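W.,

You were right to be curious about this one. When I first looked at the sequence I had no strong expectations either way, so I just let the prediction run and decided to look at it fresh. Below is the sequence, 42 residues in total, followed by the output.
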Amino acid sequence: TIEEQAKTFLDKFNHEAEDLFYQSSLASWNYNTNITEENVQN
């Protein structure tokens, strides 16, 4: 019972985490690619 809802919670979290992590990694990549102060804030 609790295992099923835990699995559902993990499935819900997996979809949301990947999109935000990709954006964070892309922002870090952009900052490292071109060292500008606006990229620091982003």
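Here's what jumped out at me. Residues 2-33 form the longest helix (32 residues). And, maybe more interesting for your project: The radius of gyration is 16 Å.

Coffee later to discuss?

I.
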